[model samples]
Target: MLAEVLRDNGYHEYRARLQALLDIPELASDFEIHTRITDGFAATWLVKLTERGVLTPVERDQIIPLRTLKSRIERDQPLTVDESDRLFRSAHITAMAEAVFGEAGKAKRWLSKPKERFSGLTPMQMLTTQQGTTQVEEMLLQIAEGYGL
Candidate 1:
């Protein structure tokens, strides 16, 4: 399931390898998710989000320090569970946007632009919490399902 999600989000290169890691019995531990991100497997997806401006200034500030340190040290810096979850949610949202829009440029535009359905909030702005993320996801799912507006 996770491999499929990663592949759907354009991380096809790491799909098979990540799938093998996820197949382990002790999936609850942070090892798999942490390694996936820190080992550079999921870096491209996160980089795409950054390039698309899906991360707000505050979000960037919060993540940049750790990211910088990890890059500087060239080591795997495991994220806290909360941070991991947040990053995953952000990636998921971007993937959904791509699926709905059918292209990266269109998805980025839609994510960064304010929408009436979100009370004039951009999808990026609605990504800070599970409730808001779910709202955006639900809306995207509706759009993908042939619902208008």
Candidate 2:
């Protein structure tokens, strides 16, 4: 299932985590693409998400200021582990939303809208913590399998 995408935290499955955002596993195939993702998928992916409407510049900037990251991903080595993890957190939730909701527009709404289960916190906001992320992740499964449907 989509659970595989979430486990990328420690393993920090960079490729799966990156590809999951777009349902493009073949992205992991090409050496160059995979290398780019592994090298520094950080700032680019965040900007991409913003452009795609999956995230807003403000929302993303709130989590990670553009300037703080501007100092990274110029292709020297790689973004630090935890720094990448923040990017991972966003993709992790967006991908799960993509899996359950279908289409970028629908999933986009699901991510931003506050939910009662979360005590009125947006899904993206909850991803800041492992516990709340688990709740949102579990809720995606529930909604996916039609439990809450």
Candidate 3:
């Protein structure tokens, strides 16, 4: 499932996400937005593995981090094992923007005036109400669509 999602959506999402990251240094902050998505993806994989009764919870925990490390590597950053791990990670500004201002209601708050509905709903609040995994996926998709993501 995870592989399928990535194979289907990751490339475009990454492109959109990277463009947003380049626009701001939110990834430089401690949120680890990009890694969080990677982690979330790994977590979903882990859950699938556990559902299959083929992997222990502890085992899944160990394996998930490896995927995250690979993601770090693919992004051209030092993995957790590297001395420069802390210094070399790429930030995901698009993810960060969603984190900070994703809800439509929050959008109004962030802006200074009569509230504008983001896509007919408050984006930040919409994100907040959704499960983390769902929200992250939608956030990435929205980014790819345009500024609302």
Clashes of each: 0, 0, 13
What TM-score, computed on C-alpha atoms, does each candidate reach?
A: 0.57, 0.68, 0.20
User: Which tens-of-lDDT digit does each residue in 48-146 have in candidate 1?
Assistant: 445556555555444345455356335444454555556666656666566557666897788889999889988877877779988887777666555
Candidate 3 RMSD to the real structure: 15.5
Candidate 2: global Cα-lDDT? 0.64
Give Cα-based local distance difference scores for all models: 0.57, 0.64, 0.37
Candidate 3 matches the true fold with a TM-score of 0.20
- Model 1 lowest lDDT segment of ten: 17-26
lDDT of 2 by residue, 45-120 (tens): 6666777766687677755767775665464335555555566667767766765665667877888999888889
Ranking by lDDT: 2, 1, 3
lDDT measured at residue 2 in model 1 versus the true structure, 0 to 100 = 36
Name the 10 consecutive residues with the lowest summed lDDT in model 3. Answer: 82-91
**Highest lDDT against the true fold, candidate:** 2
- Model 3 lDDT tens row, 43-95: 23334445654333443343335566456546755323221221112122223
